[PDB]
Design a protein around this ligand. Structure first.
Ligand SMILES: [Mg+2]
Ligand SMILES: [Mg+2]
Ligand SMILES: [Mg+2]
Ligand SMILES: [Mg+2]
Ligand SMILES: [Mg+2]
Ligand SMILES: [Mg+2]
Ligand SMILES: [Mg+2]
Ligand SMILES: [Mg+2]
Ligand SMILES: [Mg+2]
Ligand SMILES: [Mg+2]
Ligand SMILES: [Mg+2]
Ligand SMILES: [Mg+2]
Ligand SMILES: [Mg+2]
Ligand SMILES: [Mg+2]
Lengths: 109, 55, 142, 117, 49, 103
RNA sequence: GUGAGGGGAGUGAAAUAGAUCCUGAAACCGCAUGCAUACAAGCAGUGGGAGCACCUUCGUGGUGUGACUGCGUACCUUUUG
RNA sequence: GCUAAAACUAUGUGCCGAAGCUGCGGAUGUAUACUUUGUAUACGUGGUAGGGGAGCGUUCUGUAAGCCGAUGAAGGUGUGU
């Protein structure tokens, strides 16, 4: 029923990517692509890459037409975060966490 | 100043409930027949019957 | 389990008319609150509203005993630093009897959503005529 | 003979957390709050098992009073008459009849009034 | 099946379980361990000659 | 058509063909029990208020079986006093089926 | 993007055994379904309780939510408290 | 909110009112009587610091060259009792 596509290691936090992922949930593939092409967010290119991968998989493996496809489900999961040390004033040090997220997109119909 | 207690996830989501994004104004061009931002020049160089970067 | 509660969908409310000319405020208010909460019916339940609708006629003709016509004072306070308004019973019943009856009945009713729903079933009119003629209210003694 | 505290502690925590399903916030996730919540719920149940009888008796008395005043009497006078008429029906059945069977309650009130005279 | 290694038991009253302090509320010993509230006798090595 | 019977130190309003639960009784399953102490009998409009007891009225029923209710937890605790305890309880009951209210 | 990553095919008893590789829990974070929630004030529960949605050994039954209502100011130490 | 009171003085009938007493069911400690002698009987069963009694789980050793187990053990996760 659902053709899936996963993108792991997006080098961006999940909180910043969910804002973009909420825009295309439930729309058609053409409308979603048009929305993602003319946006200025950073996670937009990653979501667009994942959506194009899902559509290509649906076309090749399952042999589904592209005009009937729509964004059925989409979500973002947390990933491994890198830990670094930042020197503060008066000899103190803080811990910085570079966050990463995975994107999952399933197109249906 | 710093908080005296934790902030529950309910209040956090209630505050974040105003962080929704919005779509842009995209229209179909009359000449090229391609989707483009309204009042903006198409990526190929065409706008309002005129063509920039003549090739 | 045998003790049953009133179904809110099966409760019926009937309209009554009470004339308030030359009656004491306290006794009339207690009777109105009692008949408005629903203590007179055998299917009374504390968590369901089973009262009746009460329409008060001739609201400005209510009377109080003793010297309470000039000594009974009503206070309200706006949360501004100096907003303590005080009025007398005479002027208040002269220009707003509905506030008098609403205060008297709300003071004797429960405090909560059920009390807010019960207080809406009471209508107060200064004149001798009421617009709720379509519901066919029955005259009540007191 | 080294003993590890994993299995039994996990099982105790799991039982305590399962006994507190449906609570709000950390009362359903954190063990430290769930334990206190379960203890407080137990105490409240112990107290309400006593309060319930008083609540239901008050309800029965109110319904019987409503019925008696409908039949032209009071609760005190009707109870006194029923005690003088050698009737030993409790307040539960009286309230049930007053709510359901009007003519039976009218007959009971008539008998009580006749016994009072 | 009598007179086996799993059929022998001591006489009644010969064996007892030793007291363990500080193992909960229901154990009876409790939190302090039978020493009471703070004092010289409540500390470790608490006792006069 | 209903009756008022006494059982287990309490009073019940019974109608013919009804299943109820009363206190634990020593009567074995499958046996019949006849209450000869009826407080009130209502035949719709014929009202018999037997103040001490309705003379000549009996209610016959059958014993379905015996059982126990669900578990109830009793918890006692005294704050900052180092005292708490727990207990369980399951109350016994006997199931009766009203067969006849002849009388 | 000749990248990372993923979907097919194939090996394998097993690929949510794919090299961040036995089993793989909790705190923490998403998605979907069911119910409740935008005129009513507080240790967030407890005793009652209408309705709604799926199950059925079709009930004076089960599983979730639960408007309305009486009562109710966390835990441990130290203290006369 | 209350004025021949819903205030005060005296008196009489009723009623409400607690975990008090009684009604039914169940559990436990002590003491006596019984004709296997474990069912009755009476008194009891709030409790910190404390003293006494009885038990539930985990690891290892003998019983154990025994018993269960790929027709699925240990562990994890729900349900019923
Ligand atoms: Mg002690
Ligand atoms: Mg001291
Ligand atoms: Mg000492
Ligand atoms: Mg309002
Ligand atoms: Mg509302
Ligand atoms: Mg509840
Ligand atoms: Mg200390
Ligand atoms: Mg009582
Ligand atoms: Mg006692
Ligand atoms: Mg004791
Ligand atoms: Mg061994
Ligand atoms: Mg062994
Ligand atoms: Mg298996
Ligand atoms: Mg082992």
């Amino acid at each position: 029923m659902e053709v899936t596509a996963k993108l792991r290691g997006a080098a961006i936090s999940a909180q910043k990517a969910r804002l973009v992922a909420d825009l295309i949930r439930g729309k058609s593939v053409a409308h979603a692509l048009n929305i993602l092409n003319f946006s200025n967010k950073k996670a937009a290119v990653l979501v667009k890459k994942a959506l194009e991968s899902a559509i290509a998989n649906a076309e090749h493996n399952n042999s589904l037409d592209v005009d009937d496809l729509k964004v059925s489900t989409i979500y973002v999961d947390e990933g491994m975060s890198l830990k670094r040390i930042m020197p503060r004033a008066k000899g103190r040090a803080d811990r910085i966490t570079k966050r990463t997220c995975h994107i999952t997109v399933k197109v249906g119909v | 100043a710093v908080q005296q207690n934790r902030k529950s996830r309910s209040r956090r989501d209630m505050r974040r409930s105003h962080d929704a994004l919005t779509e842009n104004a995209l229209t179909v061009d009359q000449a090229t027949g391609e989707t483009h931002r309204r009042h903006h020049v198409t990526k190929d160089g065409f706008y309002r019957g005129r063509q920039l970067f003549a090739k | 389990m045998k003790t049953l509660s009133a179904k809110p969908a099966e409760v019926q409310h009937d309209w009554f008319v009470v004339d308030a000319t030359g009656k004491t405020l306290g006794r009339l208010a207690t009777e109105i609150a009692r008949r408005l909460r629903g203590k007179h019916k055998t299917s009374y339940t504390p968590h369901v509203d089973t009262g009746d609708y009460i329409i008060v006629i001739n609201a400005e003709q209510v009377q109080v005993t003793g010297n309470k016509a000039l000594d009974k004072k009503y206070y309200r306070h706006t949360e501004f630093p100096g907003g303590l308004k005080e009025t007398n019973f005479e002027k208040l019943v002269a220009h707003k009897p509905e506030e008098i009856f609403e205060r008297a009945v709300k003071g004797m009713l429960p405090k909560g959503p059920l009390g807010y729903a019960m207080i809406k079933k009471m209508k107060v009119y200064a004149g001798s005529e009421h617009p709720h003629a379509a519901q066919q209210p029955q005259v009540l003694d007191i | 003979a080294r003993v590890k505290r994993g299995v039994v502690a996990h099982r105790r925590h799991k039982k305590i957390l399962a006994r507190a399903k449906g609570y709000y916030g950390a009362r359903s996730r954190v063990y430290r709050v769930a334990f206190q919540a379960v203890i407080k719920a137990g105490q409240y149940a112990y107290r309400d098992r006593r309060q319930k009888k008083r609540q239901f008796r008050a309800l029965w008395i109110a319904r019987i009073n409503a019925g008696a005043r409908q039949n032209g009497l009071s609760y005190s006078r009707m109870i006194d008459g029923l005690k003088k008429a050698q009737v030993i029906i409790d307040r539960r059945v009286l309230a049930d009849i007053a709510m359901h069977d009007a003519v039976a309650f009218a007959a009971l009130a008539e008998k009580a009034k006749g016994a009072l005279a | 099946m009598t007179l086996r290694l799993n059929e022998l038991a001591p006489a009644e009253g010969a064996k007892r379980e030793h007291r363990r302090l500080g193992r909960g509320i229901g154990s009876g010993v409790g939190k302090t361990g039978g020493r009471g509230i703070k004092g010289q006798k409540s500390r470790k090595s608490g006792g006069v000659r | 058509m209903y009756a008022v019977i006494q059982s287990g130190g309490k009073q019940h309003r019974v109608v013919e063909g009804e299943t109820l639960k009363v206190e634990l009784l020593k009567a074995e399953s499958g046996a019949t029990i006849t209450f000869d102490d009826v407080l009130m009998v209502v035949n719709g409009d014929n009202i018999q208020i037997g103040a001490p007891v309705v003379a000549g009225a009996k209610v016959t029923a059958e014993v379905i079986g015996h059982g126990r209710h669900d578990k109830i937890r009793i918890i006692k605790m005294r704050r900052r006093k180092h005292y708490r305890k727990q207990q369980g309880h399951r109350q016994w009951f006997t199931e009766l089926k009203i067969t006849g209210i002849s009388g």
